[PDB]
Design a protein around this ligand. Structure first.
Ligand SMILES: [Mg+2]
Ligand SMILES: [Zn+2]
Ligand SMILES: [Zn+2]
Lengths: 195, 114, 209, 97, 252, 321, 49, 86
RNA sequence: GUUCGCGAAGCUUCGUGGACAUUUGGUCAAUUUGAAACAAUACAGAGAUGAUCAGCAGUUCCCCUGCAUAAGGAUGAACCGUUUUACAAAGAGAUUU
RNA sequence: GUAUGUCUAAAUGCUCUUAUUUACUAACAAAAU
């Protein structure tokens, strides 16, 4: 029937924050709900992991379902891509990585875990406000060779909404012109290396 | 949660030396740790008779004893211990000492060896 | 398979349409502590507070009572009272034990009296039988204070011990008292002899402990 | 630290106890030995707790001393112990407040 | 007259209604909200608040809508919702009682399920099997901070607190048992009183120990196990008989 | 080949209720929520279980506060479900944590990528899943293989060092692993929570187990013998006699084992005969079993030390006989 | 008198009556039985006293 | 007589329907995924969708329950009719 | 508020008839009194058998850990006690009618 | 595999000693050239 109400994220955030110091007879049932939710926590994990923003992406917005109790939150969308485009993107990223390696005398590899065992993971509200997330991995393009792909190649939804090159916002089917395809192929030389 | 647990959780502020000091301060006050006759499980090597009710507790029979330190050591730097037991039937405190000169024990106003 | 809910006329409401939800093994019955389907209805759509069923159908059947009201299905009287009446013309002993209560619930005997209430024959007969059977100021000289207070009000803090029988009313106003005197069981200010004696005795009793 | 006592008096546990005492005021008057000389206890609550503990001890003593082997000397000894406990209890009922 | 006396109530504001638990134990159990790994502490602590009803009692959001059940929090004396509370804020009057007398078997005046068996300590929300209007009062020593008072005085105090809270049937202080039996007209009223006076001090401002009333332990208000001595029993029987008669009359 | 029937995925069902509502969220935010929510769940469950002394880090590494007494330990041994869940949560945190770091000015995009890659390859070292479910070992191996391949492709002209991104295949592998778990965890974790709410009535043990088989068999035999004896002749107060019969049977068995002739004078022909027959049956079952065991031993076929000892003893006895 | 502390919801076999089996309503039913029972119980009150 | 074919079929249907129903009920009960009147007055029963996190059957808690036999009718246990050897 | 019509003042404003949209949520209400457990102190303290020890079951209106129809729980818990009648036949001696 | 069970009314800081342990647990396993 009638679709779900697109709620504000703010509400969700508030809900989450409420169930941090949860120890009253108020939300007795919320604790029960939380307990129940273990059932689907692995599913949730799988979802979230699946939606991992790719290195050509500063920050992915993602669809989310969440129990109004605040017990569990599923990333809802399943991330589909235009396969060749995706491959091209990956190739580009690979190239960038290689370049970085070439450049850097020492490459500062992360320490693990990234936050301390004592320190409770900062809420998202500490770094919404923070400066523009630093630039992601997308190689230096050129207008002559990669003329067609450059505008969209590194976008969250690899090809834009409301275009004639994909089905639409559902992003279920794609049809490409030749030159763009050619460009993609050229890009993907590292990965698609097939006989 | 598992007997071979590598690391016990500590609070985020746990100055270990300080903690130790605190414990020490609250060790004189403490009931257990500040007492004698600390428990032990032991089998009986002597195989002896409980002097009150004549219950013939045989060799190797297991008991939850009390080991206590005897202040008067043997020679100099090798300690000797009183090892309290109860007879099964009557609750008479049997005990024995471990004088290591003979590599054996001594009865201590509990029962008699036979 | 499930039997139907036994909710009384006054319990349920005054309207020709009520919507309710059933919650199979919702709660444990209060008597028996054994899972059963909760029916809960709102009476009128907008009238606040729900009416959940507090007992299992079986238990209700046994006691012959409304699953909400806990009153006789027929006469709408508390179980004690209804049973008491029957006795007057034997009462139920709910066994208040973890295990035994459940067992009792599962038995299907109609505990005690319930049978009489159920049958038109028996209930009616009982009723008939019953019918036949039927056919400042101190205060001195047992009855409750809520009655005394009412009386005082009519006449227009009110302490009364019963072992003493010595009620020291304190209106704290000269107006209220002087109205109270004119508008009118010994009542002084702050067989008479017999009464005095009795009062004295009462006082003594009060004072020995 | 087998047999539980050791675990109880392991340093970590002690530290935890201390922390509790500091913040909120959880003491275990079972855990510490009751003091010998009263009037080194300005707080009332503490005193009350001590009294309670001694009462408990007395009760425990009572429970055991009516055992069937009445002629054994342990019982006799306890009789004196019981008396001592009673005395202690009485003392604890001092008249400062 | 609570309706025309006031509308407002606001007993204890939502800034400071309560801290959540009181530290027994070492660690705090998130699921039960009760301290664990230890149990040392008599636990019962005196209410920071109280029902001064003449001041507090008022119209509510419930009154307008036609709520049956009275506000537990109001009774306790800490209903931060106040005028926007959905439960009623006044001492249960007779009319109200009459109105909810159908439901009063299964659940209290607070709209919460009466049980089949009494709690072993007679401690809370009485059984639907045994109707009752009769409260055990106890811990009166502790509620008055171990004050050397006259029994009579104590009794008077009890009366003062309880009369205000509901229409009294009869009250008895006892020196030997060290208690205060109260009986009410209506069960609902009794329940309300119990709710109010649970963990309450019996002390007054004029007393010298007013500022340290918090440090004590409050009134232990519970349900009355029926009095065994014979006159009382006889009276009870008579009452029962009367009730039966009334019922019969209603029936015919 | 997948489900013909099932359209109804999990999320859809949830959506169909009123209790879920849906927003659009930044992925990092979502991750954070998951971490927090997940953490809460694990604490809440733990607290319910009663064990308040196993403290969860916010990194999901669970470990005990004090050293637990034995009773406490017994109470508080969580199993293969809960631990698995914890591990999963930890993994999530690690990937989510890296992204959080990236978002914050703390770490470059390249660095973030590399970190992610490290996590996915090093799941094995980074956090114990494998401990609790040791088929994650396969996944780990696969990841390692990928790393080997990917690194060799990626560092051809370029030299050895850290900074290889290209986490994709590893990520994919982990996702696929998670698929399998979803089901297992839903049975496991779900079951656990059910137990916590409503904890089992009358479980039935199963004699297909190596342990308990023999005893069970013996019991059955005894029962059969008793039944036969009952069938045989009339008795008054037979319960008492049953015990005696059982004892007799036992004695007979012992005799057989020893190779003593079990001749008792009072034993009436029929009952005695029946007992003899059942002991013969037992012997047949026993001797054959022993032989089988011996054969197994000869092969090298997962014999129990105790079982082997028994065989040695039994076989010796047989030889003697 | 102090009761035996319960372990996991058991019955105190004084009250409640334990798992009762019926008298089994028969054909030659007579009401003197109840009276007899009452009489018997009367004596035990006296004993208690 | 060996029972009538039609009758047999009917019996099968009855039991088949019943057993199937029972199985369905059981399935419903399992926690893994994959109108009325009182007295004269008419009343609509509903089933509200509870939240999928909270325990489905919040009533049940694995309770022990002793049942009475409740055998009111008396079973007739009918029958017919060297001790030193046996 | 949207608006599609009627009637008055100067397409702008008032006054009206309609259409559109139409009964949420609660088995729950925030601290002692409707029921969590460990822990702690004290006191004892470990299946047969003489002793020491393994494992398996069994009965139950006892459960716990365990995903568990694995496995593990003090040999997981309590079982070790009480125990006089479908009551007969024969012989000998004694008091009462 | 670190057993177990009953039992429960609702002085302050100070420092100095160490190349150790009155340490405890035994459920686990047991052979020679
Ligand atoms: Mg064992
Ligand atoms: Zn009703
Ligand atoms: Zn309120």
């Amino acid at each position: 029937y009638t679709p779900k109400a697109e709620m504000p994220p703010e509400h969700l955030r508030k809900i989450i924050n409420t169930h941090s110091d949860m120890a009253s007879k108020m939300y007795n049932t919320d604790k029960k709900a939380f307990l129940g939710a273990l059932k689907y926590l692995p599913h949730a994990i799988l979802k979230l992991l699946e939606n991992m923003p790719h290195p050509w992406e500063q920050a992915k917005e993602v669809k989310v379902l969440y129990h109004t109790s605040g017990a569990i939150t599923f990333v809802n969308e399943t991330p589909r891509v235009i396969e060749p485009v995706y491959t091209a993107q990956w190739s580009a990223t690979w190239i960038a990585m290689r370049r970085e390696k070439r450049d850097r005398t020492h490459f500062k590899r992360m320490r693990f875990p990234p936050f301390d065992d004592d320190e409770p993971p900062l809420s998202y509200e500490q770094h919404i406000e923070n400066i523009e997330p630093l630039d992601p991995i997308n190689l230096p393009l050129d207008s002559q060779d990669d003329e067609y792909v450059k505008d969209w190649l590194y976008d969250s939804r690899p090809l834009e909404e409301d275009s004639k090159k994909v089905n639409g916002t559902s992003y279920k089917k794609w049809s490409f012109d030749l030159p763009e395809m050619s460009n993609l192929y050229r890009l993907s030389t590292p990965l698609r290396d097939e006989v | 949660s598992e007997r071979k647990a590598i690391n016990k959780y500590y609070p985020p502020d746990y100055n270990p030396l300080e903690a130790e000091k605190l414990s020490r301060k609250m060790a004189k006050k403490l009931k257990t740790m500040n007492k004698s006759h600390a428990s032990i499980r032991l089998m009986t090597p002597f195989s002896m008779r409980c002097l009150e009710c004549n219950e013939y507790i045989p060799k190797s029979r297991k008991f939850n004893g009390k080991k206590e330190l005897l202040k008067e050591k043997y020679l100099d730097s090798i300690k000797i211990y009183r090892l309290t037991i109860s007879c099964p039937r009557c609750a008479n405190s049997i005990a024995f000492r471990t004088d290591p000169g003979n590599s054996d024990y001594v009865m201590e106003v509990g029962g008699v060896r036979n | 398979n499930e039997p139907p809910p036994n909710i009384c006329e006054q319990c349920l409401g005054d309207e020709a349409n009520i919507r309710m939800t059933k919650i199979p093994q919702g709660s444990e019955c209060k008597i028996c502590t054994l899972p059963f389907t909760l029916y809960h209805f709102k009476t009128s759509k907008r009238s606040n507070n729900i009416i959940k069923t507090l007992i299992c159908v079986r238990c209700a059947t046994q006691r012959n009572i409304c699953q909400c009201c806990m009153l006789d299905s027929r006469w709408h009287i508390p179980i004690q009272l209804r049973d008491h009446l029957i006795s007057l013309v034997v009462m139920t002993e709910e066994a208040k034990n973890d295990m035994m209560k459940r067992f009792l619930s599962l038995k299907n005997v109609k505990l005690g009296g319930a049978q009489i209430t159920s049958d038109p024959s028996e209930a009616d007969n009982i009723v008939d039988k019953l019918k036949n059977i039927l056919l400042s100021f101190f205060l001195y000289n047992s009855i409750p204070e809520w009655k005394i207070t009412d009386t005082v009000s009519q006449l227009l803090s009110l302490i009364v011990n019963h072992k003493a029988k010595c009620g020291g009313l304190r209106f704290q106003s000269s107006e209220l008292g002087e109205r109270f005197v004119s508008k009118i069981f010994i009542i002084p200010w702050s067989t008479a002899e017999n009464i005095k004696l009795s009062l004295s005795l009462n006082k003594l009793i009060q004072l020995e402990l | 630290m087998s047999r539980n006592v050791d675990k109880a008096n392991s340093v970590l546990v002690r530290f935890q106890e201390q922390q509790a005492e500091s913040a909120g005021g959880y003491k275990d008057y079972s855990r510490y030995q009751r003091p010998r000389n009263v009037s080194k206890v300005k707080s009332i609550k503490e005193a009350n707790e001590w009294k309670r503990q001694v009462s408990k001890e007395i009760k425990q003593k009572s429970t055991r001393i009516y055992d069937p082997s009445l002629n054994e000397m342990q019982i006799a000894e306890l009789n004196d112990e019981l008396n001592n406990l009673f005395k202690e209890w009485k003392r604890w009922q001092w008249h400062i407040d | 007259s609570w309706r025309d006396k006031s509308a407002k109530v606001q007993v204890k504001e939502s800034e400071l209604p309560s801290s959540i638990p009181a530290q027994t134990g070492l660690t705090f159990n998130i699921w039960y909200n009760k301290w664990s790994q230890g149990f040392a502490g008599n636990t019962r602590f005196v209410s920071p608040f109280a029902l001064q009803p003449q001041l507090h009692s008022g119209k509510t959001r419930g009154d307008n809508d036609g709520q049956l059940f009275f506000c537990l929090f109001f009774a306790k004396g800490m209903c931060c919702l106040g005028p926007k509370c959905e439960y009623l804020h006044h001492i249960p009057d007779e009319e109200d009682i009459g109105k909810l007398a159908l439901r009063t078997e299964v659940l209290d005046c607070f709209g919460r399920e009466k049980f089949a068996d009494y709690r072993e300590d007679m401690g809370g929300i009485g059984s639907f099997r045994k109707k009752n209007k009769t409260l055990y009062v106890g811990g009166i020593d502790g509620a008055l901070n171990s004050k050397h008072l006259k029994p009579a005085q104590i009794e008077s105090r009890i009366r003062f607190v309880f009369s205000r809270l509901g229409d009294i049937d009869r009250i008895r202080y006892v020196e030997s048992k060290n208690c205060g039996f109260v009986k009410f007209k209506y069960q609902a009223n009794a329940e309300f009183a119990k709710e109010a006076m649970s963990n309450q001090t019996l002390l007054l401002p004029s007393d010298k120990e007013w500022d340290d009333r918090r440090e004590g332990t409050g009134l232990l208000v519970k349900w009355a196990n029926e009095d065994p001595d014979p006159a009382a029993q006889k009276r009870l029987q008579e009452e029962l008989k009367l009730e039966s008669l009334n019922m019969m009359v209603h029936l015919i | 080949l997948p489900t013909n029937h099932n359209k109804t995925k999990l999320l859809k069902s949830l959506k169909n209720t009123k209790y879920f509502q849906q927003t659009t969220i930044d992925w990092v935010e979502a991750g954070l929520q998951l971490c927090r929510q997940g953490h809460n769940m694990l604490n809440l469950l733990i607290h319910r279980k009663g064990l308040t002394y196993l403290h969860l880090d916010y990194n999901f590494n669970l470990k005990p506060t004090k050293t637990l007494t034995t009773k406490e330990r017994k109470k508080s041994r969580l199993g293969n479900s809960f631990h698995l869940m914890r591990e999963l949560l930890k993994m999530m945190k690690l990937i989510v944590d890296t992204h959080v770091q990236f978002r914050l000015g703390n770490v470059d995009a390249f660095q973030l990528a590399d970190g992610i890659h490290y996590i996915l390859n090093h799941i094995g070292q980074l956090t114990g899943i494998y401990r609790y479910k040791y088929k994650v070992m396969h996944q780990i191996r696969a990841c390692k293989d990928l790393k080997h391949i990917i690194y060799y492709k990626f560092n051809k002209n370029l030299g050895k060092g850290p900074g290889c991104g290209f986490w994709q295949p590893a990520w994919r592998v982990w996702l696929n692993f998670l698929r399998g778990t979803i089901p297992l965890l839903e049975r496991y974790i779900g079951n656990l929570i059910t137990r916590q709410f409503e904890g089992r009535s009358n479980e039935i043990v199963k004699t297909t187990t190596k342990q308990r088989l023999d005893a069970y068999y013996d019991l059955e035999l005894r029962n059969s013998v008793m039944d036969d004896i009952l069938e045989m002749m009339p008795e008054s107060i037979r319960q008492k006699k049953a015990r005696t019969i059982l004892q007799h049977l036992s004695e007979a068995w012992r005799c057989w084992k020893a190779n003593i002739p079990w001749d008792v004078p009072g034993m009436p022909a029929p009952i005695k005969k029946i007992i003899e027959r059942y002991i013969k049956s037992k012997a047949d079952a026993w001797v054959s079993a022993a032989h089988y065991n011996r054969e197994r031993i000869k092969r090298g076929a997962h014999v129990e030390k105790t079982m082997v000892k028994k065989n040695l003893g039994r076989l010796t006895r047989l030889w003697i006989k | 008198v102090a009761i035996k502390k319960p372990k996991k919801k058991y019955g105190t076999d004084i009250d409640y009556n334990e798992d009762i089996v019926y008298e089994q309503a028969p054909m030659p039913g007579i009401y003197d039985t109840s009276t007899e029972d009452r009489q018997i119980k009367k004596k035990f009150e006296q004993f208690e006293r | 007589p060996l029972p009538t074919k039609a009758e047999i079929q009917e019996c099968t249907a009855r039991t088949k329907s019943y057993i199937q129903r029972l199985v369905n009920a059981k399935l419903a009960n399992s926690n893994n995924r994959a109108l009325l009147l009182n007295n004269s007055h008419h009343i609509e029963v509903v089933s509200k969708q509870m939240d999928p996190l909270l325990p489905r059957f919040v009533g049940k808690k694995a309770r022990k329950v002793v049942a009475p036999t409740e055998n009111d009718e008396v079973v007739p246990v009918l029958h017919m009719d060297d001790p030193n050897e046996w």
